[PDB]
Design an enzyme around this catalytic site. Structure first.
Site, short mmCIF file in Angstrom:
data_model
loop_
_atom_site.label_atom_id
_atom_site.label_comp_id
_atom_site.label_asym_id
_atom_site.label_seq_id
_atom_site.Cartn_x
_atom_site.Cartn_y
_atom_site.Cartn_z
N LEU A 1 0.88 -1.32 0.00
CA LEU A 1 0.06 0.24 -0.11
C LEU A 1 0.99 1.14 -0.01
CD1 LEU A 1 -2.62 -0.83 2.68
CD2 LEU A 1 -3.03 -0.60 0.33
N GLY A 2 2.05 0.98 0.40
CA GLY A 2 3.05 2.14 0.59
C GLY A 2 4.26 1.72 1.33
N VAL A 3 5.17 2.59 1.30
CA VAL A 3 6.57 2.26 2.00
C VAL A 3 6.91 3.32 2.96
CG1 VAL A 3 8.66 1.13 1.57
CG2 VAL A 3 7.06 1.26 -0.25
N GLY B 1 9.99 4.96 6.37
CA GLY B 1 10.96 4.62 7.13
C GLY B 1 11.10 3.55 7.93
N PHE B 2 9.87 3.13 8.63
CA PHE B 2 9.92 2.24 9.31
C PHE B 2 9.86 0.59 8.62
CE2 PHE B 2 7.24 -1.40 11.60
CZ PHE B 2 7.93 -1.19 12.86
N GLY B 3 9.22 0.84 7.37
CA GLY B 3 9.23 -0.17 6.59
C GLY B 3 7.89 -0.31 5.57
N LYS B 4 7.83 -1.39 4.96
CA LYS B 4 6.86 -1.61 4.19
C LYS B 4 5.41 -1.85 4.94
CE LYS B 4 8.59 -3.07 0.39
NZ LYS B 4 8.90 -3.51 -1.09
N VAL B 5 4.31 -1.37 4.20
CA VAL B 5 2.98 -1.69 4.78
C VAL B 5 2.32 -2.57 3.89
CG1 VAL B 5 2.53 0.51 4.05
CG2 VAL B 5 0.95 -0.68 5.48
N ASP C 1 3.62 14.41 15.66
CA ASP C 1 4.07 14.06 14.40
C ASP C 1 2.57 14.22 13.50
OD1 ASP C 1 5.66 13.64 12.26
OD2 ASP C 1 5.33 11.59 12.10
N1 LIG Z 1 -3.79 1.46 8.62
C1 LIG Z 1 -3.35 1.62 7.24
N2 LIG Z 1 -4.28 1.41 6.32
C2 LIG Z 1 -3.95 1.86 4.89
N3 LIG Z 1 -2.59 2.25 4.74
C3 LIG Z 1 -1.87 2.84 5.53
C4 LIG Z 1 -2.04 2.36 6.98
N4 LIG Z 1 -1.12 2.78 7.79
C5 LIG Z 1 -0.23 3.26 7.16
N5 LIG Z 1 -0.63 3.20 5.89
C6 LIG Z 1 0.11 3.60 4.40
O1 LIG Z 1 1.45 3.39 4.73
C7 LIG Z 1 2.36 4.56 4.54
C8 LIG Z 1 3.49 4.56 5.12
O2 LIG Z 1 3.43 5.62 6.31
P1 LIG Z 1 4.92 6.35 6.52
O3 LIG Z 1 6.01 5.20 6.92
O4 LIG Z 1 4.69 7.41 7.81
O5 LIG Z 1 5.05 7.01 5.34
P2 LIG Z 1 4.45 8.68 5.10
O6 LIG Z 1 4.67 9.60 6.48
O7 LIG Z 1 5.24 9.14 3.89
O8 LIG Z 1 2.92 8.40 4.80
C9 LIG Z 1 1.21 5.53 4.42
O9 LIG Z 1 1.65 6.80 3.57
C10 LIG Z 1 -0.12 5.16 4.31
O10 LIG Z 1 -0.23 5.01 2.90
#
Ligand SMILES: Nc1ncnc2c1ncn2[C@@H]1O[C@H](COP(=O)(O)OP(=O)(O)O)[C@@H](O)[C@H]1O
Ligand SMILES: [Mg+2]
Length: 281
Positions: A22-24, A26-30, A141
């Site tokens: 869904l996105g990536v 610093g902490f890691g991949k989601v 944050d």
């Molecule tokens: N509960 C969730 N449901 C759907 N997408 C999520 C959820 N938590 C995080 N994400 C996705 O993960 C991404 C990573 O978050 P983060 O590591 O803080 O990067 P950023 O700060 O650029 O969003 C977010 O941009 C978001 O799109």
């Protein structure tokens, strides 16, 4: 707060298929996944235990979120520490972040009443952090990427890795002077979110003319000079009633005041946003 086997996580993500990313960050991949035989969709964050801040941030998130329950906070369903890994399971926020519906996106722009209800929802979440837990929680944050939207567009505050109990465009300038952090630092950052929702531009744009780089300085400047209407999101022009516009802008201005002690509490911000929504009718 339930513990997941690493085999349960991998079944939910189909072994962390990049199909499910869904996105990536610093902490890691989601990853997008489902558990309980597919009846519950979840978001699954995989960290790297070799990072100490990754581990700190993981531990902070579990000690905070396991004790909180609120409609406008992302819920932590559980975690997985097996193989000394760092996996966090939240419910899935189907519409992603608030930022990706404001600008630099090809999602459609959000109607004004929906933007206001999103800000109201985020304010209720922050209000709960400041007044509803055992002690005040400072999120530290607040920003448009840490407000997530579920499938019915309910706004939820997320990312509790830096929060404490007991990002450039958003940092309270009083913290580099007073060196003390308060819940008024969340109020400052939330004031920036409010101007982002109104102006649909990043809080910090380092390419602009010196006066415009920081939204938190630029938007108040424009208001005093009677020209805030000229930097509003072009989609929103003509769509905000004059009384709602004045109430929203004055609330945002109070949030980004220079000294935290002059800023309103989140309860006061929330009531003023709900009042602005009434004035829009
Ligand atoms: N509960 C969730 N449901 C759907 N997408 C999520 C959820 N938590 C995080 N994400 C996705 O993960 C991404 C990573 O978050 P983060 O590591 O803080 O990067 P950023 O700060 O650029 O969003 C977010 O941009 C978001 O799109
Ligand atoms: Mg985030």
């Amino acid at each position: 707060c339930r513990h997941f086997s690493f085999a349960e996580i991998k079944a939910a993500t189909k072994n962390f298929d990049e199909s499910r990313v869904l996105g990536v960050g610093g902490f890691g991949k989601v990853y997008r996944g489902e558990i309980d035989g597919g009846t519950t969709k979840v978001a699954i964050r995989r960290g790297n235990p070799m990072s100490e801040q990754g581990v700190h941030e993981f531990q902070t998130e579990i000690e905070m979120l396991s004790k909180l329950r609120h409609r406008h906070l992302v819920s932590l369903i559980g975690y997985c520490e097996e193989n000394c890994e760092m996996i966090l399971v939240y419910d899935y926020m189907a519409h992603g972040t608030m930022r990706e519906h404001l600008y630099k996106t090809q999602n459609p722009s959000l109607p004004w009443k929906q933007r206001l209800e999103i800000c109201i929802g985020a304010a209720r979440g922050l209000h709960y952090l400041h007044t509803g837990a055992k002690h005040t929680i400072i999120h530290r944050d607040v920003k448009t990427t840490n407000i997530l939207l579920d499938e019915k567009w309910v706004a939820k505050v997320s990312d509790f890795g830096l929060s404490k109990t007991g990002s450039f465009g958003y940092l309270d300038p009083e913290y580099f002077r007073r060196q003390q952090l308060t819940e008024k630092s969340d109020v400052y950052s939330f004031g920036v979110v409010l101007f982002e929702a109104l102006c649909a531009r990043p809080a910090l744009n380092p390419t602009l003319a010196k006066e415009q780089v920081s939204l938190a300085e630029w938007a108040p400047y424009c208001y005093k000079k009677g020209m805030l209407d000229q930097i509003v999101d072009p989609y929103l022009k003509g769509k905000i009633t004059p009384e709602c516009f004045k109430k929203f802008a004055e609330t945002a201005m109070k949030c980004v005041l220079d000294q935290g002690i002059e800023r309103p509490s989140m309860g006061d911000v929330l009531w003023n946003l709900e009042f602005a929504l009434q004035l829009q009718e």
